[PDB]
Design a protein around this nucleic acid. Structure first.
Ligand SMILES: [K+]
Ligand SMILES: [Mg+2]
Ligand SMILES: [Mg+2]
Ligand SMILES: [Mg+2]
Ligand SMILES: [Mg+2]
Ligand SMILES: [Mg+2]
Ligand SMILES: [Mg+2]
Lengths: 103, 34, 121, 122, 216, 112
RNA sequence: UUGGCACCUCGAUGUCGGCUCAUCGCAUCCUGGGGCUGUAGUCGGUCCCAAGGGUUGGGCUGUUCGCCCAUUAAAGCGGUA
RNA sequence: AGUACGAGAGGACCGGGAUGGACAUACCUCUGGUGUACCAGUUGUCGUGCCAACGGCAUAGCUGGGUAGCUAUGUGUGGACGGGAUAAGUGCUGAAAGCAUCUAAGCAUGAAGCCCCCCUCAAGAUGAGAUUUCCCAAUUAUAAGAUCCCUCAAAGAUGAUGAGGUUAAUAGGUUCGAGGUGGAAGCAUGGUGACAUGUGGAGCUGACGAAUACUAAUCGAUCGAAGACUUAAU
């Protein structure tokens, strides 16, 4: 995004180089840290990757899971500090790049 | 939606002050064929 | 770009493909101003396939150029597709783009429309 | 979103299964409601044998939506259906046992009695 | 107080200390200079006349605004500058300070201050009476011929005129709007950028005017 | 600060105020929301405000805030929460209705 | 308001509700000031100043109006063919 | 702040925030909707006595997605406090008539209302304003300085506003990037077969960004001021 490069320079020390790679349909785990007091714990979200858009700090994805009958989804920024780490553990094959036939 | 009156000879001619035409440019007679 | 020219999509895609072809044969045509600022671009993207000359560009140098016109120049016969990759491509091997040239004639009699020429250079 | 003439469902052990929304408890001509919101309902479908029959007006609370909620940390959560839970005068539930997850926003919404009972908070 | 001028560049976001998102615009502000300090004995008001972007010098066959002219050029060099494109006066600021011919650095804005922004709007052409003034449109079935239109205009043979402050179509757009009490996030110094929490008017590459708030 | 060093004090003002079956449950290997629970019950509508009005102070001794007292005025089932300790003030019989202990029957529990 | 009189208009002043827009007046429905009392406290009640702004979604029959469930700080009466 | 007050329970003044509903305005980073000259998939039939790699019409032939751009159901601010006095109503000296008494000579007090404070347009305000710099004659040419005219949008019904005119990066094109689609053609292994793998996150890409004089902004024309008079001070 070389417009005159003044925006992709300021927003440089808010990135992070800690995070593995992933395409859609690649199962992965997400160790959030959640703050509900003087100090609080982690509470993983697990699931399957359906969406990923963008570039820059404003680069997002989302994951799907079923939990006791109901479906749920959570979409996250990639560079936020909450997310300790990401753990890609499986990989697949698809032909689409946005997945909604999963409902 | 219909004229209630007649239009005088002046009000007809006060209106056409701007209803004329204009002149071309002038390059040496040669056309301004950019 | 983005000009519609009072002609819906299915019509404009076929008017800009006839202009690109009959031009090439005679290298000089006479149109209204607007149209030739739009084959200003369609035809300039169409020699840039002719310098590659590869087997793939001929396959995308046919999806806009127009059906096989059995030409007849001096004691011969051509196609508009074995003239564009053999002859124009060879004249123009060492310039960058910009090989068209618009020229303003006067207006017309009936509809009062600016008339212009367009050729190759 | 949840507005008048809306049909939620029920996720408690109190007999009422389906309902119909007819109001929202703000008041300045309010025309929707998301998670955490006290409303007014009726019943259109019950189970034989229970404590909340058909034709009884009751107040109720959201626990799930198709539209989620915009967390201040830049995060979003949207489910795949809707749901409701039926309550009492003492600001607490009619039945006892909760079914299906709920949303963490219900902790700062004085609905701690329901997170106090539910399998999966998320 | 304090005031600087500059161009709107774009819009992005940053992460706070608690991982929270904060949305921001990106203001560029270089090459400001003071050109005339004022007085009450002359004009009747104290102020500071400021100019922002540089341009080129006098030229003989001059047919743009790129190349300056003589009245302008006779006003830059006076205070030892180059020809300046944009010019504005600021009136609510102390004048015993701000000597002449200097520069104005963004560094006079801390991070976490409070401001108010002033600029131009975007252009909408000839627009109707429910995009513009935003009022109810009429039925589309049940045999109706009133869809998008202003219904009535007056009453009857009493008050046979039509009052002036009345809502009809026309043009809305490039008007002057301000925005009160935004926040300063961060202040670079090399790239000469100031960031503001929130979105502010105008199109990209436009002009922006920044100033300290007066309210509490 | 730590929780396990703060629950012998949590059973304090509820046996002071004469609570009954004032047991305590844990949720270490159960949940990820709250560490341990404390339970009780009480007889009289008068008797249910003092059991928990005390807990307001006892949270101000350690100076942890309190945020809500639900059904306090109604005086039927009341819940002061701390993310580590919870004071479920019940009625004589509503204890049986909800029957906390057996939903989490699979709870290591300890009597006090 | 139901009317009385019959002064303009019959070589045409051509229409009861509802929809869209708005505009004025207080003899005030809510908010705002206060006096008064049996207002101990609350809750009101009564009269006094005040028009800046504000003033809900739906079911039955034509429904102008009428009755009814459900919410609301409040769910105002009159003028302008 | 359970303090003034309240027979006690109850309850202000004080003044601190926290979170909201309706409403009014700017914007598109996020969430999402459209996106008819962008990317894959897919049926029918005409064109190459067929291989299908291609195109045409059939609501854009239908279906899955989607860049720039305008948008709300999304994203952020706003309501003012604060002061100058005035209604009713509280008062004090103070005469009326000794005393009295809020109005009579006096005089503090006090309402979301009224003018001032906050945003926007304004000197055709014929009461036509105020600075800053630039230009200076032999009827008469012309100076500062603008307009015609050609390339285009951050503007736009048309006029106008704005960016730029060869000492030039204005629009197009060409060479590089982004964001989007989701792994081409063509050969090569594997399957009797229709198929799947590897060479290669491949190839194509309209509107956004940069660099580069290859194309055209050529040529040349037209308007356009020369400080009055008293009456004072100089
Ligand atoms: K209705
Ligand atoms: Mg011409
Ligand atoms: Mg009809
Ligand atoms: Mg009568
Ligand atoms: Mg009458
Ligand atoms: Mg008579
Ligand atoms: Mg055909």
């Amino acid at each position: 995004m070389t417009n005159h490069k003044l925006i992709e320079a300021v927003t440089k020390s808010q990135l992070r180089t800690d995070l593995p790679s992933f395409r859609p349909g690649d199962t992965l785990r997400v160790h959030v840290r959640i703050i509900e007091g003087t100090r609080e714990r982690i509470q993983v979200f697990e699931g399957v990757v359906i969406k990923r858009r963008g570039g820059g700090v404003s680069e997002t994805f989302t994951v799907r899971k079923i939990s006791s009958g109901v479906g749920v989804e959570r979409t996250f920024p990639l560079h936020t500090p909450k997310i300790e780490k990401i753990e890609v553990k499986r990989r697949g094959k698809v032909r689409r790049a946005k997945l909604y036939y999963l409902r | 939606a219909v004229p209630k009156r007649r239009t005088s000879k002046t009000r007809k001619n006060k209106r056409r002050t701007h209803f004329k035409i204009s002149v071309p440019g002038m390059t040496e007679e040669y056309k301004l064929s950019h | 770009g983005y000009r519609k020219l009072g002609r819906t999509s299915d019509q404009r895609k076929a008017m800009l493909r006839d202009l690109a072809t009959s031009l090439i044969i005679s290298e000089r045509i006479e149109t209204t101003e607007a149209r030739a600022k739009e084959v200003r671009s369609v035809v300039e993207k169409l020699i840039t396939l002719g310098k590659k000359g590869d087997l793939a560009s001929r396959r995308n140098a046919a999806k806009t150029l127009r059906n096989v016109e059995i030409l007849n120049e001096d004691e011969t016969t051509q196609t508009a597709l074995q003239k564009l990759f053999g002859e124009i491509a060879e004249r123009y091997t060492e310039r960058q783009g910009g090989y068209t040239r618009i020229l303003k004639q006067g207006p017309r009699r009936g509809d009062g429309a600016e008339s212009v020429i367009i050729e190759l250079v | 979103m949840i507005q008048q003439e809306t049909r939620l469902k029920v996720a408690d052990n109190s007999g009422a299964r389906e309902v119909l929304t007819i109001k929202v408890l703000g008041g300045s001509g309010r025309k929707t409601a998301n998670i955490g919101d006290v409303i007014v309902c009726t019943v259109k479908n019950a189970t034989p044998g229970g404590v909340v029959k058909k034709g009884d007006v009751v107040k109720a609370v959201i626990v799930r939506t198709k539209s989620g909620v915009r967390r201040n940390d830049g995060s979003y959560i949207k489910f795949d259906e809707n749901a409701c839970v039926i309550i009492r005068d003492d600001k607490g539930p009619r039945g006892t046992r909760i079914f299906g997850p709920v949303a963490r926003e219900l902790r700062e919404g004085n609905f701690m009695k329901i997170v106090s009972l539910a399998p999966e908070v998320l | 107080t304090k005031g600087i001028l500059g161009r709107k560049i774009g819009m992005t976001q940053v992460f706070g200390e608690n991982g929270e998102l904060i949305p921001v615009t990106v203001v560029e502000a270089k090459e400001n200079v003071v050109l005339q300090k004022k007085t009450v004995e002359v004009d009747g008001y104290n102020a500071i006349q400021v100019g922002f972007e540089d341009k080129k010098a006098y030229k003989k066959d001059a047919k743009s605004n790129k190349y300056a002219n003589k009245p302008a050029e006779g006003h830059a060099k006076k205070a030892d500058a180059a020809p300046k494109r944009f010019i504005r006066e600021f009136r609510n600021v102390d004048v015993d300070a701000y000597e002449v011919g200097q520069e104005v650095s963004v560094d006079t804005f801390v991070a976490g201050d409070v401001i108010d922004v002033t600029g131009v709007s975007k252009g909408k052409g000839f627009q109707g009476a429910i995009k513009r003034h935003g009022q109810s449109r009429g039925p589309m079935s049940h045999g109706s011929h009133f869809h998008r239109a202003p219904g009535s205009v007056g009453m009857a043979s009493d008050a046979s005129r039509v009052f002036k402050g009345q809502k009809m179509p026309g043009r809305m757009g490039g008007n002057t709007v301000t925005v009160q009490n935004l926040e300063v996030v961060q202040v670079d110094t090399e790239n000469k950028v100031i960031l503001v929490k929130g979105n502010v008017p105008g199109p990209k590459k436009g002009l922006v005017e920044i100033r300290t708030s007066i309210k509490k | 600060m730590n929780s396990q060093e703060l629950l012998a004090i949590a059973v304090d003002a509820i046996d002071n105020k004469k609570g009954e079956d004032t047991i305590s449950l844990e949720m270490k290997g159960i949940s990820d929301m709250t560490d341990y629970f404390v339970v009780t019950h009480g007889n009289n509508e008068r008797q249910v405000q003092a059991i928990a009005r005390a807990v307001k102070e006892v949270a101000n001794e350690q100076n942890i805030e309190v945020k809500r007292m639900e059904g306090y005025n109604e005086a039927r089932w009341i819940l002061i929460d701390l993310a580590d300790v919870v004071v479920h003030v019940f009625h004589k019989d509503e204890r049986n209705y909800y029957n906390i202990e057996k939903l989490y029957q699979d709870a290591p529990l300890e009597s006090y």
